[PDB]
Design a binder for this molecule. Sequence first.
Ligand SMILES: CCOc1c(C)c(O)c2c(O)c3c(CNN4CCN(C)CC4)cc2c1[C@H](O)O/C=C/[C@H](OC)[C@@H](C)[C@@H](O[C@@H](C)O)[C@@H](C)[C@H](O)[C@@H](C)[C@@H](OP(=O)(O)O)[C@H](C)/C=C/C[C@H](C)C(=O)N3
Ligand SMILES: [Cl-]
Length: 733
Amino acid sequence: KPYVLKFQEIRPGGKGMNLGACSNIEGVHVPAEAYKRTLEFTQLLQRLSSAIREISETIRTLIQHTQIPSEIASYMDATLLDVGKDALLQHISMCWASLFTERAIIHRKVQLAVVIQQMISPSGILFTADPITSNRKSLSIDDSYTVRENTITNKIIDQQIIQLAKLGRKIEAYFGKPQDIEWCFYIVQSRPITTLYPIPEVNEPGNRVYISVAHQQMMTDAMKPLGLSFYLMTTPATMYTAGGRLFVDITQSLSAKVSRDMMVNSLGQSDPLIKDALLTVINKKGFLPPLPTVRSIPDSSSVFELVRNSENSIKHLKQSIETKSGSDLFDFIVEDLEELKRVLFNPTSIDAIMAGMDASAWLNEHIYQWLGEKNVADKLSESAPNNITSQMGLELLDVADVIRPYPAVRAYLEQTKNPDFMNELATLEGGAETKKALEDYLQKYGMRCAGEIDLTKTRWIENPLTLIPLILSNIKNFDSSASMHKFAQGEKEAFHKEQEILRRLQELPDGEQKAMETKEKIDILRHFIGYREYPKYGMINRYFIYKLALLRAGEQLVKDGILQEHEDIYFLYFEELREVVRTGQVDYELINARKRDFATFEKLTPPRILTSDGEMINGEYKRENLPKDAILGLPVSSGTVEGRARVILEMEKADLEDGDILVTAYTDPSWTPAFVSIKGLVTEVGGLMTHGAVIAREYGLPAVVGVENATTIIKDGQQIRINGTEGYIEILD
Ligand SMILES: CCOc1c(C)c(O)c2c(O)c3c(CNN4CCN(C)CC4)cc2c1[C@H](O)O/C=C/[C@H](OC)[C@@H](C)[C@@H](O[C@@H](C)O)[C@@H](C)[C@H](O)[C@@H](C)[C@@H](OP(=O)(O)O)[C@H](C)/C=C/C[C@H](C)C(=O)N3
Ligand SMILES: [Cl-]
């Protein structure tokens, strides 16, 4: 190993090369393992393998006590001569001592080296992409300046700064990445920006606009490559991936204008923040290219038969995939996705979904202009029949009803952390009865989980232990038969609402025509609004059957010595994994990079809108006569309540008592069992007719969605008041 080497001489410490590539310096200013012999010293270090932080005490006092054998210093001064020794000592030793306390604070017995350079004077910093919105084209320097390209947007407390903007964008190309170099124009150090949200690799002409799938799907978690792949292979929409999450391209729809006005207005009725964000993008001149100058309603028997038809499709798939392996397995999944798409996007099925959605809109619009009641379809939707997601939440109460009379079982569940607790219940009295209740519940809802759209996430039936805290809370928060009481009560309120509306309408001009037409919509509403949650349920069912088969293939790849861990298939796309099974070869520098990317994706939060310039845009609400200091959101379930806020990001750790108001990032279908005890819901994402929101209505639960940074603005334990009619939130304490 070379004792010493100057910056250009080095070829491919970390800083040792910030210098490395940079020696080139085109158009700008360029400046300018010796502790190997550090080896008394050695005895101490093997004591660290074994608190006693006194150690740093001598390991680090000898550092100052590290005597530099001249064995080479002249070399040291046989190099810096062209450009003292007491100084090298203070820090050379200084740097070594560095190894002593930090490492302890936060490991390998390998080493860091020292870099020597000179001090000069004239300063702020250069950002290649702005930090505020992550726009790759706009840049900002720190006293701070914001320039796009030779134009500055804002001036906040001046011709040479612009000369500068042009220096960063030069060296940016030398690494390709947007970078962070600080100039005081003489730059000492360099490094890339690692906080930016990735732009969807799409090299179709010009500026593009993307819609966040996470917001519509009520799930903001980063998804693994394989899971991302299966969603992309299912959707008919022009969808792409970025930052471990999914986005839909709508740029072409924005080029024409009747296409635009049908896209902007429609998305605005799922959540107003999309529209406000879109209109802002449109108002950005120079970005978006210049514009140039009744559904059918199925029979009553359709829903029953749509469910039956789907169930048997799953049943057939389950039998066919058992005999498949290797390349045959992948060949089968490719042609089964067509069957998935058929059941999921069946014209009759879509008509059944929209039948409930259209009826909700019809009521909410007409009843308001007639009687003055806003969002009456919420209360009319309470305890709607045949909602596979609503049933899931309430039936967990039934599970708790079985366990409650058994003290021996309860003592176990309260303390157990065994994933295989299902097979330890027969020992206890009532465990056999408890096992049955759990197995039956998991036979209906086991294929679901938080993040179910990601095929690679742990399902309930794979880790039943996550359902335990919800079960325990049900035992503590409720008496027996709470499922029947809650549902029956919902039916009463919904019917009393129906009779009230029809009665009041007959007092208006042309009474018994507004009522009869309303009665028709209410029937349609309560007959179809439940089916809304089912196509998702049928899709997830296929996903879990896929997962089990892919795991078998992953385990075969382990047996064949090709894969190390069988869950490493999660970081390969379907297209790639199919080749691994076929050829028998796999690039693990890729797999490790995928894992490395996923770890940074989790630290990212998807914007409502993402552009080609990496700009992250979330819409703004309009405060029309709403209270000031009120946190605005989208009202999706009528009612006003005061309760204790509970900021909970993971359902497994939710210790919900009666009176609590759930504040969280998202509520996908799997969150439903936590709706039974709370008296209000607040989410950061979601829309009018998305997951969670549709369930809150049927549960008679006041909910406000689309509340930005609700898990940060609202503190856990705070008393808050939410209004699910107007869509605002107040802090009281
Ligand atoms: C401009 C927004 O663009 C999107 C986005 C963001 C999407 O996430 C879209 C999307 O996930 C899908 C799909 C599949 N939609 N296809 C489109 C063309 N097909 C012939 C039939 C249906 C599109 C997504 C898009 C969409 O192009 O843009 C508008 C989406 C709207 O969402 C607010 C709207 C169409 C939405 O429903 C509205 C009306 O309430 C769509 C997505 C569905 O009907 C939902 C009801 C959705 O339900 P959910 O996801 O279970 O809550 C449907 C049933 C989902 C089926 C799952 C399937 C795997 C699929 O890929 N669907
Ligand atoms: Cl344990």
